[PDB]
Amino acid sequence: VDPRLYFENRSKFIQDQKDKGINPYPHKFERTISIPEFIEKYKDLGNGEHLEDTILNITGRIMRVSASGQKLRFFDLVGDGEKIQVLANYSFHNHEKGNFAECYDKIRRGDIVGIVGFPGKSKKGELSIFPKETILLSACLHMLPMKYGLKDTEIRYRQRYLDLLINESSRHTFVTRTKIINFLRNFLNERGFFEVETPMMNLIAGGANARPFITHHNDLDLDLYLRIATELPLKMLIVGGIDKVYEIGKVFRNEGIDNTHNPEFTSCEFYWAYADYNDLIKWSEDFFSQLVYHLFGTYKISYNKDGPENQPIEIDFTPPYPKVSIVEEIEKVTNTILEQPFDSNETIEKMINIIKEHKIELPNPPTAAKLLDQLASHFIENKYNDKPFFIVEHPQIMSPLAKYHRTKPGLTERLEMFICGKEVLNAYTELNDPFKQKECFLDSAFCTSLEYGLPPTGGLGLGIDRITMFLTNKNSIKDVILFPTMRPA
Amino acid sequence: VDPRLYFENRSKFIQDQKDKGINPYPHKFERTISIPEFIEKYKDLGNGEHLEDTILNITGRIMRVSASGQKLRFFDLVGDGEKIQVLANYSFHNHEKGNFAECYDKIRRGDIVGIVGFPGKSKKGELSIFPKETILLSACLHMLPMKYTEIRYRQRYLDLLINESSRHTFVTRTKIINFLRNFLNERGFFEVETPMMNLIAGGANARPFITHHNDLDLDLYLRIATELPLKMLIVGGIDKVYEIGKVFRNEGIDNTHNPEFTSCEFYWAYADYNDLIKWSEDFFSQLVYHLFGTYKISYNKDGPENQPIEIDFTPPYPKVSIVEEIEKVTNTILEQPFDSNETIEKMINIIKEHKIELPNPPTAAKLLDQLASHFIENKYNDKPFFIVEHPQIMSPLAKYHRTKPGLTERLEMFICGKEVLNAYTELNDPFKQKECFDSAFCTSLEYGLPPTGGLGLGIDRITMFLTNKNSIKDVILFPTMRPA
Ligand SMILES: COc1ccc(OC)c(Nc2ncnc(Nc3ccccc3S(=O)(=O)C(C)C)n2)c1
Ligand SMILES: COc1ccc(OC)c(Nc2ncnc(Nc3ccccc3S(=O)(=O)C(C)C)n2)c1
Ligand SMILES: N[C@@H](CCCC[NH3+])C(=O)O
Ligand SMILES: N[C@@H](CCCC[NH3+])C(=O)O
């Protein structure tokens, strides 16, 4: 019951074994069959049926230990998320290799073993390996936690391997994450898109609005910023004639952690020459509905928006999805007209007064972009929870890289998709007239590339972590990142 | 002639177009067919044949401008690395949408255009689009060079437009990564992401990038390798696991070293030394064949000014034991332990005698590595080969060699004297890892890491050899250069 003493005794056991001449960490066990392959090949065996002649080399982790006397021992053996029984019978044991009770009394829960033996089903119908020899391949020197010990605790995050071993669902969550990325890469590749890598460190940090990580480059004697987005170099590649280009990789925003924000997170951005806003809406509806159908066989999924203690809501990914104009909708809900320019003195004061009157946190500084974002967050971002929806046509002052709207003054051809109040996608017709990129008197290099001719283009960025959270029923981003950056205890 | 004046005139032209009510940057042109699709569909047309029953919308970048009289205008139009001719004839021009001469006088090299027209070949046989209307979609405001030596790295988009071998190099890079991903996935490997920043930086020997994490109020380190968290996933039961992504080593730049570079590492439970050798031989031979349809390639080891060599990727590859080959080539014997005062002095004397550069500090591992670099690592340029069985003191995470004292079951593959692969049987006895007696990694070992084999590949260097480049800046789209 004392974990410290358990580990001390296991450690002495290791030493005792090697100076009895047994190597508890051997170099190579030549495995013949994986546990999933074993289950696939011998599941249809009849009750009590043994393939006594069929000798197999199999490995796995012991996850349960019991006995039916000194003469017959039972274990659960797990590998690759699957499980079989180990039935060690005294009569099947190769006694030339050592005493039966001596070999099996040593085994502890968590030990990785290699087994030579034959396949069979017990009379009770349990698919089993019947050993003639089992050898310790690598010992578990600690007591493994119970599932209960992983529930309301940080052990899942600081010792993710324990989560993966003990909680069947944890493996499934991370398998789904990789299936999502695989689906996305194949979806883009089938449509002619070309995957690239752009630098993780740069002299500026552009393509979004976020505080950067800074690091010193020793050889250049220069401070560089980790990228906050891939947007600028990818557009430069469009100028270079890679007309469908994308990148899946980490980006970094040096701000506060919470349940939907991790400072390092996985983004996909793609740029599509000769596409516009409307192509990107259709792309999003095709992608999300096909992805959901690919994973689940239906367009509707269950999501516990308010945690596992509350009822799930159903999210319908059947397209098309609603589109909500941000300014028109704020004006309606607040019953207040917001006249252009949105950064005029009068319209600033009106937004603050709305925020004052409704007791909504005033952003600091109280800039027009920040006020609009705050108003959108409070009044529209939870308009729909039964289905994804787009917030569209953001003001130019919120959207310095999006192309001006072709009919609506002061607005852009921008869309953001929201699921359950959370943004997962940001896309727009790209601003490509260098004379309107106000900041091009923010990189000189980008600005200059625009002067060489950026074709009309649509670009889009996805939050892969947030998408995975919704498709694996998680409420916290730490449950979809293998090794979330924790406070060091 | 002047770039600056040319840009000013073009800028003034953009404003003048705006003042006349034309939007020189329209929002959307609905394209019917891509340029490569246009070539594939109409390549088999007969010389002089037109298909005026087929109106097509096509886009591209103008790369050449000429004319045969005021009545006929010719252009090169490029897209997706392919090219057609544009043949603007007064007869087919839609005059209701503007003056023919005035529309085409304005087009410059580099302009992105949309064209409504019909397919056809000229009498001379050149596949062409015949416009009834051409719309400027985005102007090139600078002069586009034809020839230009660091512009390639500081304006990679210019290199990609002009050079055509540059595009092919970066297509090959993505084909290499795609092949590797598919190669691993078909063998049951599971792709993951592990953190790019951590509280320590282990899995290799290199100086770190340091950054400050505002929310934790901690100084974190960019990863130098993915080795440690991937092994922790093996402990967690993901028995075949890999990651492809960037790692960071804060040291000097040269032609085969970039501080941020792309690595793939995989970990393979129950595999050992010999499985890793066979994986490497299978992967490299199949990758080369996939790209080239042969196992033999040409590589300009000493640049385009010197003769190339042939590299033969037909397996199996030679294996060379590091210590015994050093002893053979230098006719000495380096008695164990290698950090004995006698063996250090012996190694230092070989280096001093040959006027080779003495590493600072003159540590046993660094002396061994210098000796291998000067006496072994170019044993073959004919073919890749492995240097194997590195001493434990060079390899603190590799499992002890099962028959040779003081060594490990490690392998490094070299091409033309450059390492592209590092692999070994993983050390998994926690009591044998002297640093343990990273705490997170050391703790994970106490829960049981099965016997495992791990391997890392340098994707950038591999791409250099397979695209005939001598510098890593030629296979990275935006290599980080010294600024102004
Ligand atoms: C201002 O930006 C930040 C700032 C701080 C952060 O962590 C400290 C983060 N971190 C973070 N982590 C996971 N996901 C997202 N998504 C996300 C977040 C905001 C808006 C849109 C999206 S998005 O998914 O639609 C896509 C387009 C990226 N952000 C992002
Ligand atoms: C000590 O390590 C460093 C230090 C500083 C660096 O740049 C400043 C670098 N940069 C770098 N850049 C591209 N490739 C390689 N490969 C590479 C380099 C050395 C040995 C093996 C290999 S390896 O390819 O076999 C593979 C296993 C990684 N290193 C690497
Ligand atoms: N860089 C954007 C995504 C791409 C938007 C379209 N150019 C973001 O991080 O939100
Ligand atoms: N981390 C190693 C590659 C894997 C070595 C085997 N565990 C390197 O950067 O060279």
Author numbering:
A (entry chain A): 78 to 518, 535 to 582
B (entry chain B): 78 to 225, 230 to 518, 536 to 582
Reproduce passages from the article.
Aminoacyl-tRNA synthetases (aaRSs) catalyze the synthesis of aminoacyl-tRNAs, which are crucial building blocks for protein biosynthesis. Lysyl-tRNA synthetase (LysRS) has been validated as a promising target for antimalarial, anti-Cryptosporidium, anti-Pseudomonas aeruginosa, and anti-Mycobacterium tuberculosis therapies. We determined five cocrystal structures of LysRS in complex with the compounds in order to provide a basis for further optimization.
In comparison to compound 38, compound 36 has one more methoxy group substitution in the para position of the original 2-methoxy group. Compound 36 exhibited the highest PfLysRS binding affinity among these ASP3026 analogues. The ΔTm of PfLysRS induced by compound 36 was approximately 11.8 °C in the presence of l-lysine. Compound 36 also showed strong inhibition of PfLysRS enzyme activity in the ATP hydrolysis assay, with an IC50 of 198 nM, which was also stronger than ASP3026 in vitro. The ALK inhibitory ability of 36 was significantly reduced, and the IC50 was greater than 19.1 μM. The methoxy group inherited from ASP3026 in these compounds were all bound to the hydrophobic cavity formed by Arg330, Glu332, His338, Asn339, and Pro340 like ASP3026. The additional methoxy group of compound 36 formed a new H-bond with Arg330. Compound 36, in particular, exhibited the most potent inhibition with an EC50 value of 736 nM, surpassing the potency of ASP3026 by over sevenfold.
